[PDB]
Design a protein around this ligand. Structure first.
Ligand SMILES: *[C@@H]1O[C@H](CO)[C@@H](O[C@@H]2O[C@H](CO)[C@@H](O[C@@H]3O[C@H](CO)[C@@H](O)[C@H](O[C@H]4O[C@H](CO)[C@@H](O)[C@H](O)[C@@H]4O)[C@@H]3O)[C@H](O)[C@H]2NC(C)=O)[C@H](O)[C@H]1NC(C)=O
Ligand SMILES: *[C@@H]1O[C@H](CO)[C@@H](O[C@@H]2O[C@H](CO)[C@@H](O[C@@H]3O[C@H](CO)[C@@H](O)[C@H](O[C@H]4O[C@H](CO)[C@@H](O)[C@H](O)[C@@H]4O)[C@@H]3O)[C@H](O)[C@H]2NC(C)=O)[C@H](O)[C@H]1NC(C)=O
Ligand SMILES: *[C@@H]1O[C@H](CO)[C@@H](O[C@@H]2O[C@H](CO)[C@@H](O[C@@H]3O[C@H](CO)[C@@H](O)[C@H](O[C@H]4O[C@H](CO)[C@@H](O)[C@H](O)[C@@H]4O)[C@@H]3O)[C@H](O)[C@H]2NC(C)=O)[C@H](O)[C@H]1NC(C)=O
Ligand SMILES: *[C@@H]1O[C@H](CO)[C@@H](O[C@@H]2O[C@H](CO)[C@@H](O[C@@H]3O[C@H](CO)[C@@H](O)[C@H](O)[C@@H]3O)[C@H](O)[C@H]2NC(C)=O)[C@H](O)[C@H]1NC(C)=O
Ligand SMILES: *[C@@H]1O[C@H](CO)[C@@H](O[C@@H]2O[C@H](CO)[C@@H](O[C@@H]3O[C@H](CO)[C@@H](O)[C@H](O)[C@@H]3O)[C@H](O)[C@H]2NC(C)=O)[C@H](O)[C@H]1NC(C)=O
Ligand SMILES: *[C@@H]1O[C@H](CO)[C@@H](O[C@@H]2O[C@H](CO)[C@@H](O[C@@H]3O[C@H](CO)[C@@H](O)[C@H](O)[C@@H]3O)[C@H](O)[C@H]2NC(C)=O)[C@H](O)[C@H]1NC(C)=O
Ligand SMILES: *[C@@H]1O[C@H](CO)[C@@H](O[C@@H]2O[C@H](CO)[C@@H](O[C@@H]3O[C@H](CO)[C@@H](O)[C@H](O)[C@@H]3O)[C@H](O)[C@H]2NC(C)=O)[C@H](O)[C@H]1NC(C)=O
Ligand SMILES: *[C@@H]1O[C@H](CO)[C@@H](O[C@@H]2O[C@H](CO)[C@@H](O[C@@H]3O[C@H](CO)[C@@H](O)[C@H](O)[C@@H]3O)[C@H](O)[C@H]2NC(C)=O)[C@H](O)[C@H]1NC(C)=O
Ligand SMILES: *[C@@H]1O[C@H](CO)[C@@H](O[C@@H]2O[C@H](CO)[C@@H](O[C@@H]3O[C@H](CO)[C@@H](O)[C@H](O)[C@@H]3O)[C@H](O)[C@H]2NC(C)=O)[C@H](O)[C@H]1NC(C)=O
Ligand SMILES: *[C@@H]1O[C@H](CO)[C@@H](O[C@@H]2O[C@H](CO)[C@@H](O)[C@H](O)[C@H]2NC(C)=O)[C@H](O)[C@H]1NC(C)=O
Ligand SMILES: *[C@@H]1O[C@H](CO)[C@@H](O[C@@H]2O[C@H](CO)[C@@H](O)[C@H](O)[C@H]2NC(C)=O)[C@H](O)[C@H]1NC(C)=O
Ligand SMILES: *[C@@H]1O[C@H](CO)[C@@H](O[C@@H]2O[C@H](CO)[C@@H](O)[C@H](O)[C@H]2NC(C)=O)[C@H](O)[C@H]1NC(C)=O
Ligand SMILES: *[C@@H]1O[C@H](CO)[C@@H](O)[C@H](O)[C@H]1NC(C)=O
Ligand SMILES: *[C@@H]1O[C@H](CO)[C@@H](O)[C@H](O)[C@H]1NC(C)=O
Ligand SMILES: *[C@@H]1O[C@H](CO)[C@@H](O)[C@H](O)[C@H]1NC(C)=O
Ligand SMILES: *[C@@H]1O[C@H](CO)[C@@H](O)[C@H](O)[C@H]1NC(C)=O
Ligand SMILES: *[C@@H]1O[C@H](CO)[C@@H](O)[C@H](O)[C@H]1NC(C)=O
Ligand SMILES: *[C@@H]1O[C@H](CO)[C@@H](O)[C@H](O)[C@H]1NC(C)=O
Ligand SMILES: *[C@@H]1O[C@H](CO)[C@@H](O)[C@H](O)[C@H]1NC(C)=O
Ligand SMILES: *[C@@H]1O[C@H](CO)[C@@H](O)[C@H](O)[C@H]1NC(C)=O
Ligand SMILES: *[C@@H]1O[C@H](CO)[C@@H](O)[C@H](O)[C@H]1NC(C)=O
Lengths: 317, 317, 317
């Protein structure tokens, strides 16, 4: 009679369909998903240092909008900007806004150091009812609105050397009055001009008098500029009116900091990968949650699923 | 005696050479080409909506050059700009020309809506012999050349609210006269200035008096600017001379529209993929016709041929 | 008794570990390295035409700094800029510096042709003690500092047609005096203005009077501009003061030229691939020396080694 000896392999009742080079649908015994397609919905506060902007854009926190005083000198790995954020100070613009936002975001600090600028012969600390703190007239915390002193505004020609080891970031502005009479009222002369320089750079800005649509009841504007001063270089501000003066400098660092627009709530939890939709697990190589990511993240792809076979072809009985 | 039974495979007398991982030349029984290397030479008018610019650049059709009146309010999927196109109006430039061209191309419409601007106290509808229609002096159709009225040009301070659901695109300009006397002749004062603003943006432009080389017998110039006004925002134009005024706004849409530079003839035929050399079939995954494409196109590669084996190794008798 | 016949394969005592799809460490009989990770440390002078900038940036060689006269009319495949380079002329800036540097680098020539500009009614060839040659006061070789003649500076309105087959590159500038009295001293009027135009472009620049920090004992500045003039177009310079005039044009070519920042010494040797660290062999497909390359180079990757098996699995006795 003898014997029979059969060689074989396993199978399962519940196989999974995968793609191959020669067939778009072949059943295997098991597979694993390579695309992360879900988020928790919240941004985990760990292990990156998260700073929720709340009502403040980064730029408003930089300048010192009345609603942003709690942000002074804070650092972040990721600054989270909310869609509801709005300004509540003097109406302003920033030529190149995107670049200033980017460079501050990347620096990852609002560390500010006051300096003693000699603003000889003018009135300091101007305020406005468009920028209140506690119902008092106020202004951006990091800027100094200079006006005439006894109807004189003598030329400013002011120096500030950088004798530090690090670069200094200076934020400053120009005031664009609504009318010729507002110009004379504030600065005691018919126009102004501002030249801000270092040994290696120069910027000059001319105020432009005229009506813009009222924002927080103001038809004038401030335009914001910036200047970086290297170790052993010197900031020189030369102006005859309309200067929104710096009060000091921001530290500028390099590192892994960034900024993200998101309305996701921040949670007490730990996740390396952040998207605007919330944190996502990072076990998988790919993800289809968002092209926008921060941290150790899977790579964004268009597919919502990619199944890797982890078993043989399934050939059921 | 018994029998002989031989297993085998086919071969062909006319095999084709392909590349593999281990050999750059191996003969197989059959192959197919994966690189599209030929075009029809014409651009098929279907199924994309093609607009042939003919003598008009997109920007000339936007502004309303005399040769471009047939383009009013037209839409396109693909605007085709011809190398022979030339201007036949007042000589102009557009700072950022490439961006305005791009944003209009992408919007895919020249839909224009007139608005009733209150140009109080000035002469409207200025014309020039450098911009004729039917031998009459004329001007860009979408712009309004304002000049003095009885040797006065009172300050303009004009508002236009956007109470629509959509964004408005405003095109406007500044006139740069050739001399101080041309300046006084046209505007009744020694210089002008233009500030165009919204709640969230501002642009001011100063005219620059002087000689440029004559183009269509004109040594002055117009410089063209634009402003986008969001729903619930307000356009404000504040000017004292030299304003080339808007007559209304363009609609701005988003969608799949673009622009292509090509001299290929447009034909009555149907092809999904357009290149500057003409339409190409899109059965193949790759193509070497042109890096510039529009529609459902094969991907541009440097190779002029890539043969995919569709049969076994050919081993002839 | 019969015989035994065994089939087998070789092995070696000194195998090498490679990576595969299924195993990160498998020993094979032999392998070859696909990542170039070392350089010679020097840049080979062959076969690309190398121009060592020595003390001169490309822009200083363009303008004609006193230390750069040996560079006149030189050509290069690769201009090598040294970190020690410094300027020794009048302090200047170039708005868009990076673009002018790039376009000259890519052109690959400093070929200069003098032209006879009619600077009627002014003093030519101004010099300064901040820009000495051989202890004499001097100036940039390719620029012409115009000042008043007998306390008059009549308006300049000067033309230069391009009747060549090629494009002309014009370099010119604006002088920004330190004070109102320096302005009057040099130009005999209270301000200047410069409009440089062609049939298809225009640039106007306003001088900005004021103090900048002293560089080589100078608190004023020059700002450098450029203009390209096509065949059959015409350069027109219209100015009333502060013009740093062109002396002629640079040829502008297209080809394979570039610029590299490196402190590597130049050697007498032959290598197709240049990096800032020195030339590297180009037998391998990949390299991890530097992302910055010029010539026929392996592709930059992050890995420092990638071993390709060139033999079977090693199975020692
Ligand atoms: C189908 O194929 C997949 C992929 O092979 C397979 O999934 C794998 O299953 C194993 C076993 O369950 C998982 O191993 C676990 O991994 C987690 C980390 O995420 C560990 O926490 C687990 O630890 C347990 O066991 C340890 C033993 O030392 C203990 O230390 C500890 O107490 C834990 O209880 C464990 O190592 C592995 O993560 C997955 N892999 C993937 C990619 O999902 C799945 O099992 C297969 N299914 C079938 C039906 O065969
Ligand atoms: C070498 O290999 C290639 C690739 O396999 C092979 O080319 C293929 O040939 C087949 C058969 O001729 C083609 O099939 C045709 O495809 C077109 C679409 O482009 C259809 O219009 C054709 O329809 C005909 O037959 C249909 C049957 O139902 C009818 O509906 C109709 O009336 C038509 O007459 C047909 O399906 C196929 O497109 C190509 N593929 C490629 C990539 O070219 C070629 O035949 C092989 N050569 C040899 C000598 O073996
Ligand atoms: C392990 O695998 C590698 C890769 O296969 C293998 O390296 C190769 O070795 C051969 C033989 O030494 C090399 O061939 C030489 O290539 C150089 C060019 O760089 C030539 O100059 C050499 O020419 C000599 O021989 C010629 C014969 O006609 C003569 O013309 C001349 O006089 C020269 O003496 C020769 O062709 C080849 O370059 C390498 N390849 C790589 C990628 O390194 C290595 O030998 C293997 N090791 C073992 C132990 O098996
Ligand atoms: C130039 O044009 C602008 C824009 O039209 C004019 O601005 C407008 O000025 C009026 C008068 O001051 C403003 O009215 C105010 O509205 C607020 C809000 O309801 C109200 O609280 C005040 O009591 C007053 O009614 C109006 O807001 C403002 N509009 C805009 C869009 O800014 C300006 O007056 C013109 N200038 C001249 C000199 O004509
Ligand atoms: C750059 O800084 C300098 C240094 O302060 C400024 O120059 C100075 O400007 C003042 C006032 O504008 C000048 O004084 C005036 O002199 C005239 C002429 O006699 C007189 O009519 C006025 O009543 C007043 O006294 C001063 O002369 C001048 N100093 C120098 C050394 O030139 C300059 O204004 C600053 N630039 C900017 C853009 O602010
Ligand atoms: C400033 O310089 C410019 C450039 O050289 C001068 O422009 C030139 O002006 C002359 C005189 O008007 C123009 O001549 C005209 O040429 C046309 C074309 O053939 C002809 O039809 C007219 O009858 C006349 O001859 C010339 O075209 C023009 N050149 C350029 C390049 O624009 C300008 O005159 C100078 N201004 C002053 C005040 O000197
Ligand atoms: C921005 O829009 C306003 C509103 O029209 C313009 O301000 C107004 O400008 C006019 C004419 O330039 C001023 O009138 C002049 O007053 C002087 C001083 O008495 C007189 O010498 C002139 O004969 C003329 O009457 C008017 O006062 C002024 N209005 C206000 C409220 O300040 C302004 O010009 C516009 N800006 C631009 C850049 O166009
Ligand atoms: C406006 O402010 C600037 C910046 O503080 C002043 O520039 C400074 O001017 C002084 C006086 O000329 C310069 O002093 C010189 O220093 C050199 C170098 O040691 C020395 O050789 C000279 O004998 C003299 O002492 C100083 O270098 C310069 N500083 C900078 C940073 O540029 C300018 O004087 C002010 N203008 C007015 C009108 O007040
Ligand atoms: C653009 O080039 C033209 C052509 O030279 C310049 O225009 C000319 O400028 C001069 C001097 O600025 C003017 O002369 C002056 O006339 C007045 C009025 O009588 C007088 O007070 C002065 O003493 C002097 O004679 C000349 O009239 C004028 N020519 C023309 C045809 O308008 C212009 O200045 C140049 N632009 C720039 C930005 O340099
Ligand atoms: C994560 O958020 C993104 C961004 O909002 C979502 O992507 C959008 O999805 C909507 C459909 O509801 C599309 O209309 C948009 O085109 C997408 N936005 C952009 C900017 O491309 C996405 O659905 C979210 N993913 C998960 C897993 O929650
Ligand atoms: C399609 O048009 C392109 C663009 O003109 C052609 O590519 C050019 O080919 C010429 C040779 O005649 C080269 O000198 C140029 O370098 C190419 N132009 C550019 C801009 O790179 C191409 O030959 C055409 N292809 C087909 C199939 O007609
Ligand atoms: C070639 O030069 C580059 C550039 O300096 C070297 O890369 C740097 O390596 C240092 C470590 O000493 C790092 O701190 C820097 O991040 C690298 N620089 C940049 C700009 O990324 C590299 O080591 C050199 N390679 C060889 C083979 O000599
Ligand atoms: C098949 O069933 C087993 C046991 O319930 C399970 O662990 C495995 O993941 C299933 N296969 C699927 C879901 O494809
Ligand atoms: C943000 O602003 C809203 C009003 O716009 C206010 O209700 C809320 O309390 C503010 N939040 C903070 C943190 O200041
Ligand atoms: C301006 O305000 C600061 C506090 O913000 C104060 O220290 C300083 O003395 C004030 N200076 C003047 C001149 O008012
Ligand atoms: C070989 O000949 C057949 C019959 O003529 C043809 O259909 C096939 O495409 C040919 N092979 C080529 C052109 O490589
Ligand atoms: C375009 O311009 C040329 C003359 O430059 C003319 O012959 C042709 O008819 C014009 N075409 C159209 C459509 O206006
Ligand atoms: C300007 O021209 C338009 C037609 O283009 C006309 O409706 C309008 O009445 C004219 N206005 C003036 C003031 O000439
Ligand atoms: C093994 O030894 C031989 C002979 O010395 C040598 O040629 C070969 O490259 C060696 N293998 C290595 C270094 O992996
Ligand atoms: C470059 O400058 C240094 C001084 O800074 C000098 O020693 C050297 O000789 C100069 N080299 C050349 C080639 O001019
Ligand atoms: C200016 O200098 C050049 C030599 O650099 C000389 O040929 C020319 O004659 C000089 N012109 C004047 C007006 O000084």
């Amino acid at each position: 009679p003898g014997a029979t000896l059969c060689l074989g392999h396993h199978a399962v009742p519940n196989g999974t369909i995968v793609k191959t080079i020669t067939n778009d649908q072949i059943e295997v015994t098991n597979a694993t998903e390579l695309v992360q397609s879900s988020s928790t919905g919240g941004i985990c506060d760990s292990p990156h240092q998260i700073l929720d902007g709340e009502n403040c854009t980064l730029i408003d926190a930089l300048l010192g909008d009345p609603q942003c005083d709690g942000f002074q000198n804070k650092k972040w790995d990721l600054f989270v900007e909310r869609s509801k954020a709005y300004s509540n100070c003097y109406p302003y613009d920033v030529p190149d806004y995107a670049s200033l936002r980017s460079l501050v975001a990347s620096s990852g600090t609002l560390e500010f150091n006051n300096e003693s600028f000699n603003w000889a012969g003018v009135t300091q600390n101007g305020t406005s009812s468009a920028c209140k703190r506690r119902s008092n007239k106020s202004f951006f915390s990091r800027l100094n609105w200079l006006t005439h002193l006894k109807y004189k505004y003598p030329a400013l020609n002011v120096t500030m050397p950088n004798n530090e080891k690090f670069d200094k970031l200076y934020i400053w502005g120009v005031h664009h009055p609504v009318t010729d009479s507002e110009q004379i009222s504030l600065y005691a002369q018919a126009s102004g001009r501002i030249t801000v320089s270092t040994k290696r750079s120069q910027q000059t800005v001319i105020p432009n008098i005229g009506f813009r649509p009222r924002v927080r009841d103001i038809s004038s504007r401030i335009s914001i500029y910036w200047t970086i001063v290297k170790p052993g270089d010197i900031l020189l501000i030369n102006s005859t009116g309309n200067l929104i003066a710096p009060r000091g400098y921001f530290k500028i660092r390099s590192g892994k900091s960034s900024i993200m627009r998101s309305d996701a709530p921040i949670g007490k939890c730990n996740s390396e990968c952040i998207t605007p939709n919330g944190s996502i697990p990072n076990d998988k190589p790919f993800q289809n949650v968002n092209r926008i990511t921060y941290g150790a993240c899977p790579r964004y792809v268009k597919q919502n699923t990619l199944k890797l076979a982890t078993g043989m072809r399934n050939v059921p009985e």
